[PDB]
Structure formats: structure tokens, C-alpha cells
Amino acid sequence: KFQRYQLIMTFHERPVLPPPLIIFSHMTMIFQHLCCRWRGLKLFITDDELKKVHDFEEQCIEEYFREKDDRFNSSNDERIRVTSERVEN
Amino acid sequence: SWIERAFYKRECVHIIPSTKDPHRCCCGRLIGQHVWSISKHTQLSPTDAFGTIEFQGGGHSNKAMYVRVSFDTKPDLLLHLMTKEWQLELPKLLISVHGGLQNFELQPKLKQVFGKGLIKAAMTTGAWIFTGGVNTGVIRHVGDALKDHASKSRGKICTIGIAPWGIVENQEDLIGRDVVRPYQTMSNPMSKLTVLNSMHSHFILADNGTTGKYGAEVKLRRQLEKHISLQKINTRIGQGVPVVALIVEGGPNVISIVLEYLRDTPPVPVVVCDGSGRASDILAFGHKYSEEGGLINESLRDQLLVTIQKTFTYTRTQAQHLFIILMECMKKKELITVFRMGSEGH
Amino acid sequence: QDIDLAILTALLKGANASAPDQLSLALAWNRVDIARSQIFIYGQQWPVGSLEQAMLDALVLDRVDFVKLLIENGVSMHRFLTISRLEELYNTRHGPSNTLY
Is B56 close to C75, i.e. CB distance below 8 A? Predict the structure, then answer.
């Protein structure tokens, strides 16, 4: 599941034409590189969806810290502990 | 955008009543902060400030919505700003609250009971909360209660503070239409202009053209609570959205604002609290000792005017007159309510 | 709370200093709740500018609870983060150890 990333990013960068005919796509890239010299799969969302995904992220962060605190405040050990210090008082 | 044409600010063109402080005009604006329509001679200019406050500082920083409005704005259009542009579903219930405008403290047992109370009043129903909005007394303790649910409960409060824009600290910080600024929760201790409570999620800071004094849209908030309660609820089988009023340590004028909500049609029910203080315990010892409402006995009629001469320190004839207001209030006790502290008050 | 609470209170109120001095002692004792109730009293006259310098001294000593305190009072970390002070925070050789060198 980790190696799938490498397999996908190397096959997206590697050209279209198969190895028997890759010399054509190859000379297209060297010819186009010299032609431009003579002359990650990103998503590029704008500033509005930047505002939505940061807001999304704050909601996830707040609920994660909140549920972590609630699982500590509902796990049986803590409840036994709380009951013990309060019966002491 | 649409907000800039739908609502207006008020461009206050004074005749400069210099009076005590020559900068301070009829409304109290600065010497260059010039340019009501009577002797302040304001003239309706378009709205120039609305967006989102991040509330930078104060620990947890929370996005809230602001629009600067004027006072004589169309009320149903204000609800159109509420529901479409700010994206707020219509209230299933409304909880108006009025209290001590001075920054007070309630008793700590009643503090956490009012605190864990008012929020599950909002969370269960999906209630809208109309209130003031700067950190002054009852708003500051509702805001401590709004930190108090934001420790545990997952849901959000749709608490629309309607505070005067004339009591906006740093009016230039949030000025700007469709602009988003983070308002510092840094409150100067000598700032006569008070920071808004960061916990309130929504802000009508309307403005009758004035600076530095309250009451900018208190009459507008009342008639805005009128047209909402005129609109039917989604079931619409004979009812509108209900509006309830809540009074804790209220000031002297909110006795006659209680009498306002009672005398308005339909009579908005009112709750008070006990151990709270000021107006709302003298309408609660009023409520305890009403007998037949306005048929309060003569000795406690005198005990009314003495205690208004002790807390509000009003002259004995006009504190008798505030008893005359109180007797018409307590005659309508059936819409009124008492919260006894724990005890026997439910 | 125990005797430690009220003794720290007593040394923080019979010292009768100004609030910067109060917090500069309080961070040295690291008892953050004593500074939370007392030193950050409701409406207490905290002198201006020392809320930023006390933040600086808090973060150079790894006083995470004092940092959370001053954030909670309203020290803005945006206005706190200057280039020179991020530099000076990167320059310090105090508190814990590190492999920066």
C-alpha cells in the first residue's frame, strides 16, 4: 500500500509510447526541450476552497481533541479514580 | 455585495454641538468624525462594513459573522441577510435576553446553573439567541457560558448578538465592505468602547449614526423580534416561531422593557432569576408578593419604592412610579416566570 | 489546593510589585494557576508591552502552561512573532538541550 505511490508517480511521469516506440516520444521531449530553449498530481484549488478546507481541518482538530478528552473522561480507570478521591473528601 | 445595496449606514453630518468637549458633537464623535436627523442631521449613506471576524487572541479564535447596519432598516430584509447571506436556518425558537448593562457578577452557584441552563435551551431546539454583544455584564456571563459549552458539546450556537455599533471598540478595525479582519480581543481597561464577546457567532452591529453611546438599535431589535414571531413555524398548524425573554440582574429600564414585551401583541413570556439582583429580584419579590397581581398590599408597595431607592437609588416619588410600572408588570404574572435557585423553582 | 497555594499567594501579594515583576516571579515558580487567579485578576492593570516580553521569557524556559495562559488572556501570537524575536528565540541556549549546534 505504500509502494503504490511510487508505482503511480513513476508511471504518470513516464511517457505514453511503449518502449519499442518510446524513441519517438523521447525525441519529442528532447526536440521540445531545445525548442523551448530556443523560444505531483496537484489540485490547485483557489482561495475560497482554501478557506473551506482550512475550516474543515479546524473542525476535525477540535473534534479530535474533544473526543480524546471525553474518552479519557469516560474510561473506567478514570471513573474509579474520580470516585475514590471524591469518597475521600 | 447585495448587502451594500440592501442596507445602509448613516453618515452623521452634525451642526457640531461642542458643549463640554469641543471634539464631541451632538452624538459624541471626534472633531473629524463628523459629516438622528434632528440636530445630528444624519443622512443615509450605503453600508460600508461587513464580513467575518476571526477574533484573534483570547485563546481559542472563532470565526463569527458581522454586518454594520443602521437603525431604521427594513426588518424582514435583516432576516433575509440572516438566512441567505449569512446562511442561518430560520429559528425553531428565539431566546431574547436583557440584563445588567453594567459589568456585574452573579452568584457562582447561579452562574453555572444559568450557564449550563441557557445552552441546552439553545442546543435542543436549534434556538436563535438574541442578546447585546459587547463584554458588559449579562453578555459577558453568557459568553463565559459559551466558552462553557464549547469545552464539551459538538453543536454550534446560532447566537446573534445585537449590540450597538456605537459601542464597537476599534470601529476602524472592522470597517470595510466584504472585508475580513481579525478583531483583537485585547480589551483596554480604560477603553470606553468595549470589545464584542468572541463567543457570539453572529453580529448585528446596527448604528443610528451615533458614536459612544448605547441604544443604537434597541427599538429595532424589538420590532425585529416582532416580524420573526409573525412568520409561521415550519409545521404552521396555528403558530409562529415562539419568542421567550430572559432577565438576569436587569437594569432599571428593562422593567419597562419587560412591560414592553408584555404589552406587545402577542405577549412575549418573560423569565427571571433569583439571587440575580437589581430589577429582576424586585420583579421576583414582586412576583412572590403580587397577591392578585397589581393588588400588591400597601406595606410592600412602600417596600418596593424603598428598595428601588436603595439599589437604583431613585428619588422616592419616581421609585414609587417604578412601582406603578411594576404593578402593571406583576398583574401580568402568568406570562412572567420565576426561577428560584434550585430549591422549588423547577 | 494546599499550603503551597496560599504561600505563593502571600509572596505574590505582600511583595506588592507591578504585574511584570509578579509574572516574572510566577514563571520562575512555574505554578501557573496561582498566576492564573491572582496575577491575572479581573480588570487588573497589566502594564502594556510586558505581555510580549513575558511571553518571550515564557517560551525560552519551556513554560507551556504560561504560554497557554498568556495566549488565553489575549497575547496575539501574530503580533508576538517578529523577525528579530523569532531570531532571538532561535538564538537562545537556555532551557532544554538541542542538536542545533
Answer: no
Residue C66: other Cβ atoms inside 10 A: 22
Select from B97, B131, B72, B127 the least CA-distant residue to B276: B97
**CB B187 within 8 Å of CB B159:** no
Method: cryo-EM
Which residues lie closer than 8 Å to B321 by C-beta, 6 or more apart?
none
**C contact set with B (CB within 8 A):** 43, 45, 68, 71-76, 78
Q: Do chains B and C touch (3 or more CB pairs under 8 A)?
A: yes
In this complex, the chains that touch A, judged by 3 or more CB pairs closer than 8 A, are B
> Rg of the Cα trace of chain B?
21
Nearest-angstrom CA–CA distance, B49 and A59: 27
Nearest alpha-carbon partner for B38 in B22, B14, B16, B21? B14
User: DSSP letter at C13?
Assistant: H
Mutation target to probe the A interface, by most A beta carbons within 10 A, among B152, B153, B178 is B152
Dump the DSSP string for B218-266: HHHHHHHHHHHHHSBPSS-SS-B--EEEEEES--SHHHHHHHHHHHSSS
- Map B206-226 to HEC letters: EECCCCCCCCCCHHHHHHHHH
Residue B311 phi, psi dihedral angles, 5° rounding: -90, -60
Pick the closest to residue B115 from B151, B152, B141, B154 (CA basis). Answer: B141
- Grid cell, residue B131, equals 442578546
Helix (H, G, I), strand (E, B) or coil at B87: coil
- Inspect the structure and tell me whether chains C and A have 3 or more CB pairs less than 8 Å apart: no
Identify any residues that bridge with B196 across adjacent strands, giving them in sequence order. Answer: B134
Minimum Cα–Cα distance from A67: chain B residue: B152
